[PDB]
């Protein structure tokens, strides 16, 4: 396909896109330049040329909840005379537009460095793409991952690995013992070795004779001479965690009513109220888990939740 004819179509398509923005991966997908790597190269070159000639501008857009999930987009400018489809994420408020213009500590082992950032990142955790990029940059992702398999663990400084989903991308998330604490919803001392023999006994009694090898004697001349002959899900868990704190911040009791669903949504941080069924599912799970007691008010028919303590 001759790309030299299509440059006008690329500018007109971006010009006709909502707010003059289009994802570059989605633009490739529309014009069907995804069928062959030959067509892909032609398209990436064309987008770059239109950017250099100032007909379009390459811009980033950043997920308001995840600085590593950023979308490569083209912005319209004037008329001609990382690969996940993010058309899902572009539906949100998503206003974090940015027009385009390494922490590795030698002295402490790599284990303690992933632990420290997984701790400092708090109860929200950190993604493997954040950890690798901030510690060592993109090129070291191989040697990092072949190292992390020796110490990250499946669900006292232990690190837990848990799956997560954003947009259309699935990635591992890291959390420290903070996870155990917030799943429960830090070890003390340990025993000294109780071994008591004198080092002289170990330097004597632990000896075993070695194989015969090069040996020597001193001649009458004082000369040294030789002898060798003879020798269940992250969003549900986060919501259940929230429902206790959203009760306790009011008191030992709450009502399961509209303004409570609003408060759960508002403490969680959503721009719109969560569906009542989604909240009731987790309320029922934590009630059944005995974290909450619940009953009907006998003089109103409204439902009460309370802390059993």
């Amino acid at each position: 396909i001759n790309i030299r004819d299509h440059l006008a179509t690329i500018v007109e398509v971006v010009k006709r896109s909502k707010n003059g923005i289009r994802q570059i991966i989605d633009l490739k997908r529309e014009l069907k330049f995804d069928k062959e790597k030959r067509l892909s190269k032609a398209f990436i070159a064309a987008i770059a040329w239109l950017d250099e000639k100032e007909y379009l501008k390459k811009v980033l857009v950043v997920s308001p909840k995840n600085p590593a999930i950023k979308i490569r987009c083209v912005k319209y400018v004037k008329d001609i005379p990382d690969n996940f489809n993010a058309t899902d994420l572009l539906q949100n408020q998503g206003l974090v537009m940015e027009e385009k213009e390494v922490l590795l500590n030698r002295f402490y082992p790599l284990q303690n460095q992933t632990y420290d950032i997984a701790d400092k990142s708090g109860l929200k955790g950190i993604s493997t793409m954040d950890v690798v990029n901030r510690i060592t940059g993109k090129e070291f992702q191989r040697a990092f991952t072949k190292s992390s398999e020796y110490y990250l663990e499946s669900v006292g400084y232990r690190l837990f690995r848990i799956y997560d989903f954003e947009g259309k991308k699935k990635f591992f998330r890291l959390f420290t013992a903070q996870n155990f604490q917030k799943l429960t919803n830090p070890k003390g001392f340990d025993e000294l070795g109780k071994s008591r023999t004198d080092l002289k006994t170990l330097n004597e009694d632990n000896f075993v004779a070695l194989n015969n090898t090069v040996r020597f004697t001193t001649d009458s001349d004082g000369q040294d001479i030789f002898f060798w002959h003879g020798e269940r899900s992250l969003r549900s868990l986060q919501r259940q965690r929230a429902i206790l704190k959203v009760m306790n911040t009011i008191g030992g009791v709450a009502y399961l009513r509209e303004q409570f669903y609003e408060s759960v949504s508002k403490y969680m941080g959503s721009t719109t109220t969560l569906d009542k069924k989604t909240v009731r599912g987790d309320v029922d799970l934590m009630v059944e888990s005995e974290k909450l007691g619940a009953r009907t008010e006998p003089v109103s028919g409204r439902k009460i939740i309370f802390l059993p303590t």
Partner: protein
């Protein structure tokens, strides 16, 4: 003119950042990749379509090594047998003959013909004297110089090659090092009659080396010094060498010394533009390149020849892999080499971020860029076969400078009647034979009429010896295609293959160069050199002219005479049309 698209070598690795690329006489590229060599084997195609992949096909070249220093314990070099599993560390092709020599990791030099080992070089002496670090080929005659750990430039020279496998045998050794000193040879360069060698302590010696002299004068042109010699070349008898922050120019006509600061510590490769009117060199490094004119005085000038292309490619790559200018980036050059004719350069390189890289074999790859060094070019007597075509294609198909009196066409005068095998040698050594071979790479239908006149004249002179039937059949075929009188003879020729025998009247061989008809009414095509009927399943094919040649090592039924045996033994590998190696099945 635009440069051809780069040859993309994939999944190959290099163990060190030294010069790893060499380019043989027949146009074959050699890359000292780890653990096995990668050969850019040459091929023919007219529709190159701007892509270098149509000239060079890349394949692993798994040689096999045996180690003469095995069983023998390492002394003052502790590393000698440190890794006992051998791999190639240096690889150079012959500049006039047609062999390859390779330095093994454990310091042997071994010589090879294609994938077959010829001989492993050895001489009496202490363990260090038997251990080599650099080697070079004589630019004029069949001999090799090797620099050992004792600081001796040892000579080996070559015989027996016409009768059997070439014998490499020990001749002599100049001790270039001081008495009882521990420094050893690192570089050797040999241009026309002058040899120049550099020891580890940076002491450099220039001497005239010739068969006519037993006593070469080892004149030390540079005293022992601190700064390491990164590269060393001979350029119109001026020696050129480079060190961190400096380029040193020396004239061997008077042994005078001179210097210029390079302004950077990156390693500089010396690229001598031998065909220029004034002795001149390009200096190349991973960050900058420039042209130094070597007159009586030194100079700094723009590398307009090569730098603009590399800068474009580097900007193009940067636009994708460093679009924010987030990373410092470098152009790593794993090797640079001149074409055997000296009119073109090949650069093997990759673009990389300075970072916490942990690479693996499957992710590694390299681009080989081919580029013209001049606006005009000519055939050279060193380069052969596809090497001429390579330069022609690199110069955007621009034709070479033909003689003004000859612009077949020329068919130059040949007042000769030398001994027959040597007559074919002298015939192929002629300038007129070389331009004919190149012209066949350009015209729509290849031809060899000029060469046939040389065999016709030989057969017409040697009339008293044309007693064999096949020999007569060959001569009659030449006479008829040439439109010159056919020698008088009578009777029937017989030819055979492994299952079938055919009788031919000598008169059945018409003047037609395409076909012949047998007495049994069966038609057959003619061979591309002896003109005989192609009756056997053992012909080699010419990759240029598509003609067929009978393999005389495979035939065991035809009773060939001196002319037919001698023709085929002289053309059993090299094409009579184009100097290329014939393909085999």
């Amino acid at each position: 003119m635009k440069l051809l698209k780069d040859l993309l070598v994939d999944r190959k690795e290099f163990e060190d950042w030294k010069n790893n690329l060499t380019w043989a006489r027949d146009g074959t590229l050699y890359l000292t990749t780890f653990p096995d060599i990668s050969i850019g084997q040459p091929k023919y195609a007219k529709d190159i379509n701007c892509n270098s992949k149509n000239l060079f096909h890349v394949k692993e070249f798994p040689l096999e090594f045996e180690n003469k220093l095995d069983f023998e314990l390492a002394q003052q070099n502790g590393l000698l047998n440190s890794q006992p599993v051998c791999y190639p560390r240096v690889c150079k092709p012959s500049p006039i003959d047609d062999w390859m020599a390779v330095l093994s990791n454990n310091g042997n030099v071994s010589v090879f013909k294609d994938n077959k080992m010829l001989t492993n070089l050895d001489s009496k002496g202490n363990l260090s004297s038997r251990t080599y670090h650099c080697f070079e080929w004589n630019p004029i005659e069949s001999s090799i110089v090797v620099g050992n750990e004792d600081g001796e430039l040892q000579f080996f020279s070559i015989r027996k090659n016409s009768e059997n496998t070439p014998e490499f045998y020990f001749e002599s050794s100049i001790r270039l090092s001081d008495a009882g000193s521990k420094d050893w040879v690192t570089h050797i360069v040999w241009y026309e009659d002058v040899l120049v060698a550099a020891l580890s302590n940076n002491s450099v010696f220039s001497m005239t080396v010739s068969a006519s002299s037993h006593q070469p004068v080892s004149r030390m042109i540079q005293n022992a010094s601190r700064r390491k010699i990164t590269d060393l070349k001979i350029v119109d008898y001026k020696v050129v060498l480079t060190c961190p922050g400096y380029v040193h120019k020396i004239d061997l006509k008077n042994y005078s010394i001179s210097s210029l600061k390079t302004g950077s510590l990156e390693n500089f490769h010396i690229i001598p533009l031998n065909h220029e009117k004034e002795s001149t060199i390009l200096l190349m490094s991973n960050k900058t390149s420039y042209k130094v004119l070597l007159e009586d005085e030194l100079h700094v000038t723009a590398d307009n020849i090569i730098a603009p292309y590399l800068e474009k490619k580097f900007k193009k790559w940067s636009t994708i892999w460093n679009e924010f200018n987030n990373y410092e980036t470098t152009l790593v050059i794993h090797g640079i080499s001149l074409s055997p004719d000296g009119y073109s350069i090949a650069i093997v390189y990759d673009m990389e971020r300075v970072a916490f890289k942990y690479k693996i074999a499957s992710e590694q790859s390299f681009n080989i860029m081919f580029a013209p060094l001049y606006h005009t070019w000519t055939i050279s007597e060193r380069a052969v076969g596809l090497a001429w075509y390579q330069t022609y294609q690199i110069y955007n198909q621009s034709l070479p400078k033909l003689p003004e009196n000859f612009s077949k066409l020329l068919n130059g005068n040949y007042p000769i009647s030398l001994d027959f095998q040597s007559y074919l040698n002298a015939l192929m050594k002629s300038e007129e034979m070389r331009i004919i071979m190149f012209l066949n790479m350009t015209i729509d239908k290849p031809s060899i009429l000029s060469f046939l006149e040389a065999l016709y004249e030989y057969a017409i002179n040697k009339k008293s010896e044309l007693t064999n039937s096949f020999d007569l059949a060959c001569v009659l075929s030449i006479a008829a295609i040439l439109k010159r009188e056919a020698p008088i003879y009578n009777g029937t020729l017989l030819m055979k293959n492994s299952f079938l025998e055919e009788t031919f009247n000598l008169e059945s061989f018409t003047a037609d160069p395409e076909t012949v008809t047998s007495t049994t009414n069966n038609t057959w095509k003619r061979c591309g050199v002896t003109l005989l009927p192609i009756l056997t399943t053992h012909v080699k094919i010419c990759p240029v002219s598509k003609q067929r040649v009978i393999d005389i090592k495979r035939d065991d039924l035809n009773d060939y005479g001196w002319f037919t045996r001698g023709l085929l033994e002289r053309f059993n590998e090299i094409s009579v049309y184009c100097g290329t190696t014939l393909e085999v099945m």
